[PDB]
Design a binder for this molecule. Sequence first.
Ligand SMILES: NC(=O)c1ccc[n+]([C@@H]2O[C@H](COP(=O)([O-])OP(=O)(O)OC[C@H]3O[C@@H](n4cnc5c(N)ncnc54)[C@H](O)[C@@H]3O)[C@@H](O)[C@H]2O)c1
Ligand SMILES: NC(=O)c1ccc[n+]([C@@H]2O[C@H](COP(=O)([O-])OP(=O)(O)OC[C@H]3O[C@@H](n4cnc5c(N)ncnc54)[C@H](O)[C@@H]3O)[C@@H](O)[C@H]2O)c1
Ligand SMILES: [K+]
Ligand SMILES: [K+]
Lengths: 320, 317
Amino acid sequence: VPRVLITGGLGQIGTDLTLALREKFGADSVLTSDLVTPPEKHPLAGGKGYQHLNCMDRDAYEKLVKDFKPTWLFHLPAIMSVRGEAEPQLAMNLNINSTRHALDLARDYKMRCFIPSTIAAFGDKCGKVNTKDDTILNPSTVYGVTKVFTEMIGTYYREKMGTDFRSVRFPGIISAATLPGGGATDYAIHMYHCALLGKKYVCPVRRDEPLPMLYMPDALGGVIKLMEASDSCLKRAVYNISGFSFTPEQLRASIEARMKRPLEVEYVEGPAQSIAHSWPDSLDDSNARQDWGYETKYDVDKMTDDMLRQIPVLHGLPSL
Amino acid sequence: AAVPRVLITGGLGQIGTDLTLALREKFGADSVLTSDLVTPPEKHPLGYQHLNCMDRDAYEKLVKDFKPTWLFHLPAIMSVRGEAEPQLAMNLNINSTRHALDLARDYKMRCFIPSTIAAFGDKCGKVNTKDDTILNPSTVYGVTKVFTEMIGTYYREKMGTDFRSVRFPGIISAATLPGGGATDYAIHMYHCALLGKKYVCPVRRDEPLPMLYMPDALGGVIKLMEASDSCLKRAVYNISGFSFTPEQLRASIEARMKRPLEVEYVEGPAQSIAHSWPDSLDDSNARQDWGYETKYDVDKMTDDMLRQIPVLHGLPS
Ligand SMILES: NC(=O)c1ccc[n+]([C@@H]2O[C@H](COP(=O)([O-])OP(=O)(O)OC[C@H]3O[C@@H](n4cnc5c(N)ncnc54)[C@H](O)[C@@H]3O)[C@@H](O)[C@H]2O)c1
Ligand SMILES: NC(=O)c1ccc[n+]([C@@H]2O[C@H](COP(=O)([O-])OP(=O)(O)OC[C@H]3O[C@@H](n4cnc5c(N)ncnc54)[C@H](O)[C@@H]3O)[C@@H](O)[C@H]2O)c1
Ligand SMILES: [K+]
Ligand SMILES: [K+]
């Protein structure tokens, strides 16, 4: 089995990925690291197999890599769309420089190295319907700019520096564990919570604005399957992967169908809209399907049923 | 009062040298300050100030002291060097660019940072390559220049910064020798023809590349920098001069000197890089938006180069 190091591992993806890999390869084979100490209530709090690491600190990163001798590296820290627009300097510092450190370390310590990209790599010239893997990239966010960098330098390391870098363009990832906040694609989790509370929701994304989205189990399944794939099957370094595409109105309909009662939504455009409009409406993921057998288990209604069952248990909202 | 106050960084290299001279002639010597990491060699053509653009405080100090209205940020590690020294290429080409853009934003400068055909890779559509296409550069240099284009565009769009750029072809000039490696064969071939010695060419005999003679390159950059914001529909523009292969340039030189030139093709790293680059470029946006034009065809460039190199470098006529 692999020895796995995850960095930025206390966040939305890192937490679930830590859990899934421990269950698949055993607890002792996974070390999770993060800038910050796990909060008291955090699923990974107090567990063995946690170490602090600021990925901006190259010596500290190398030290932990030499200590633990991982064979797989999941480099997850980045500043995303909304926070990046407000703190562009931080976004560039983290998204560019930590990326460089991860790649240099995967090279020299011969690790299989996953650094996720995002649909934010795309802009309004991408060809928004069934967006291809190879297209025009003109991201409108600093985040997206840094993620184009990540893709291109990672690909360069794969082609010219003998480094086993692997990546997907994630759509927005939905999870029952996440507290709704100010994120570009957070409206969906807000909708599910408001449905359960029976409260009105003010949505900042336009009512008919479609986005590619992905349910957390399908995302984790895809990452793990990509990381297990034979190099011989990987015709490219970066793959689009998709779950489904929906608009706020569509998600609302899925929720109302499941609950058999109305969800009250009011559409007031927020900062998320301008970001969302600049992203694809849907993704073409045929290359991931063909090369390495990417697939998904959840459609929208199945995600909606799962979310409405999980949220009451995980957060203590009213159950259906 | 309408005359631009110009700061050039990385100014002692191939482009900076001729750009400084062109701007002094256009606007007066007092209006241009050139700066570089290294100090001017004895026989260097070059109004000078030392500046390491990696030192952000020093860069800000010079900007605050001189108060330029135009900034030309020229330092970068180019294709061939960048393959050998990827760390340095990434440090300089990413971080010095960041410094330039932040200073151009805060001190309200019109900010030129050049890109290159090296931003393209083998998926760009090699014939008449468009401004908007797939970018898959094969060099770390090209990766850093896509970054440059994308972050500069982001600053123009969202950070109120007057960032302007062109994708330069291979630039040919008689004065300062090139630093880049890849398209340098053209200049080397002229020198060899004049010395009457055999040239060893690292690029495949029939590999076409976009090239551009320095006066057209500079005329274009200057015209872009003079353009109103209103006519600029994009931040980054392909500009083109001509497209040729090594053997076509060999023929141009031979026709002008009326004697043969010995060339031996030994395909090296430069060929792999060159083959990933466009064969020719589409510059219709630059022509449409701000009136880009050129005056030199290959024959005229050849005529100029063979007459100018001996005068500047004391080679035989
Ligand atoms: N969640 C999504 O929908 C989504 C979509 C596309 C791409 N992605 C990519 O997935 C990755 C992880 O996303 P996420 O939602 O889990 O992020 P998150 O914000 O939930 O967590 C990121 C983690 O990085 C840590 N971190 C920040 N700076 C650090 C540093 N200097 N050193 C070490 N750790 C540091 C944070 O403390 C945090 O625990 C990012 O690269 C992101 O761009 C996520
Ligand atoms: N010449 C070409 O054909 C060509 C083609 C495409 C794009 N470009 C771009 O034009 C720009 C200038 O190219 P060039 O051919 O004049 O390069 P050059 O190598 O001839 O000159 C680069 C100059 O930058 C200086 N420099 C390096 N590090 C520095 C630092 N830290 N601070 C300050 N100065 C520093 C060097 O000392 C040198 O004088 C580069 O961005 C290059 O990518 C050039
Ligand atoms: K969209
Ligand atoms: K070519």
